[PDB]
Structure formats: structure tokens, C-alpha cells
Structure 1
Amino acid sequence: YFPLQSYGFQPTNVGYQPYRVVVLSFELLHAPATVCGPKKSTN
């Protein structure tokens, strides 16, 4: 035995449906910024 289990996703299924999920995790550190909002810089 191994712990793997498989779903059986059918179009007729609502918590029974497949769900796509993305988790955005944000690296707050005092290192250089590299991912930023589109807000434009000034002089």
C-alpha cells in the first residue's frame, strides 16, 4: 500500500467538482524589491 488516492471528476457532479486553486505567497523581506505594483515613480 501507498497513501495516494485519485479523484473521479465527472461533468454531472458542486463541492464534488474539480477546483483549480492558486496561492499567491508574498515574500516580505528587507532584501531588494523585485515584484511591484504598477504605481509610477516620481523624481
Structure 2
Amino acid sequence: FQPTNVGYQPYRVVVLSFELLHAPATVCGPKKSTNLVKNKCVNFNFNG
């Protein structure tokens, strides 16, 4: 890796693998939670 190298140049790479499972979520997006409502028809979202 000389600075004079275009695809010959160094590239940094990060690979994000999501441990997506039907299991306890623990990394989540900035979306805020509501209070909980019961015994009424509701448009829910639990952990995505």
C-alpha cells in the first residue's frame, strides 16, 4: 500500500451481521416505546 496505488489502494471494511432471532432483543433502533393497551384492537410493534 503506497499512496500512488485505484482499486490497488487499501480499503477499510466493516461487516455488520444481525443476530436476528425469535429471542430476547438487545440492540434496537432509536424508536420510542408507548404505554401498553389491552382488550382493544391495536396496531402493535414488539421488538420490530
TM-score, length of structure 1 as denominator length = 0.74
**Ranges in structure 2 where 5+ consecutive residues have no aligned partner:** 35-47
Residues in 1 aligned to 2:23 and 2:32: alpha-carbon distance in whole angstroms: 21
Aligned-pair identity in percent equals: 97
Which residue of structure 1 lines up, in the alignment, with residue 17 of structure 2? 25
What is the RMSD of the two structures over their aligned residues, measured on CA atoms? 2.7
Extract structure 1 runs of 4+ deviating beyond 2 A.
none
Larger RCO: Structure 1 or Structure 2 (Cα < 8 Å, ≥ 6 residues apart)?
A: 2
Provide the C-alpha distance between the structure 2 equivalents of 1:40 and 1:28, rounded to a whole number of angstroms: 20
Question: Given the two structures, how large is their TM-score scaled by the length of structure 2?
Answer: 0.67
Q: 1:30, CA displacement in angstroms?
A: 1.1
- Structure 1 residue runs of 5 or longer lacking an equivalent are 1-8
How many residues end up aligned between the 2 structures? Answer: 35
